[PDB]
Structure formats: structure tokens, C-alpha cells
Amino acid sequence: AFVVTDNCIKCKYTDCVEVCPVDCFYEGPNFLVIHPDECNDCALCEPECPAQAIFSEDEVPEDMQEFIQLNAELAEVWPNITEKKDPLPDAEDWDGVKGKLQHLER
Ligand code: SF4
Numbered sequence: 001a002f003v004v005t006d007n008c009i010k011c012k013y014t015d016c017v018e019v020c021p022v023d024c025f026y027e028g029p030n031f032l033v034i035h036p037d038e039c040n041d042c043a044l045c046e047p048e049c050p051a052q053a054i055f056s057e058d059e060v061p062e063d064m065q066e067f068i069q070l071n072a073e074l075a076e077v078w079p080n081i082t083e084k085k086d087p088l089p090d091a092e093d094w095d096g097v098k099g100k101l102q103h104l105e106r
Pocket residue numbers: 001002019020021022023024025034038039040041042043044045046
């Protein structure tokens with residue numbers, strides 16, 4: 001499974017959903033997650049993220065290991081997203097800022 005980590009929060013560019021063959025992205029107010037059972041590890045989405053926030057599960061940085069479980073849980077509760085939309089308004093002020101997990105909205 002590929003996993004969306006911290007830099008997506010408060011950016012949520014959604015360029016990633018164009019390239020997914022199985023539509024396994026689920027949408028939250030200011031974050032996206034990848035459904036771990038659905039993703040066929042095609043890796044097509046992780047060049048496409050502007051925030052470079054997608055990683056192969058096995059390549060998630062040590063300080064972002066929380067996101068693996070997080071993607072798995074919120075994929076169960078958030079609605080599926082299949083079309084690209086506009087980036088959140090202030091997306092590039094937040095692009096690159098660390099520790100945005102405290103801003104996550106459910
Ligand atoms: S690795 Fe492929 S199947 Fe998984 S979320 Fe990305 S585009 Fe979809």
C-alpha cells in the first residue's frame with residue numbers, strides 16, 4: 001500500500017487522484033488517505049503529488065510511521081474521491097511546514 005503522510009495536510013492538491021487506476025483515495029476536510037486493501041502498489045501517484053507526501057508503505061520516514069495506521073482508519077470513514085479539485089486556498093504557504101498533524105480535521 002502507498003500512504004499519504006504529513007505534508008498533504010493543509011495543502012490537499014488532489015493531483016494524486018487522477019493517476020489512480022483503482023480509485024482508492026478517500027477525502028477528508030484538509031487531507032487525503034489511501035485505502036490499504038484497495039491500492040495495487042502501482043506507484044503512479046507518488047511522482048504526481050506536489051507536496052511529495054506519498055510514500056511506499058515500506059519507505060515511510062521513521063518519524064511519520066503513525067500515518068500508516070492513520071490512512072487505514074480514516075479510509076474506513078471518509079468518502080471516496082475520484083475527481084481532481086482545486087488545492088486548498090492557502091496550499092503553498094503550508095507546503096513544506098512540518099508537524100501539520102496537529103491541524104488534521106476529521
Ligand atoms: S499506488 Fe496506485 S493503486 Fe495505490 S493509491 Fe497510488 S495510484 Fe492508487
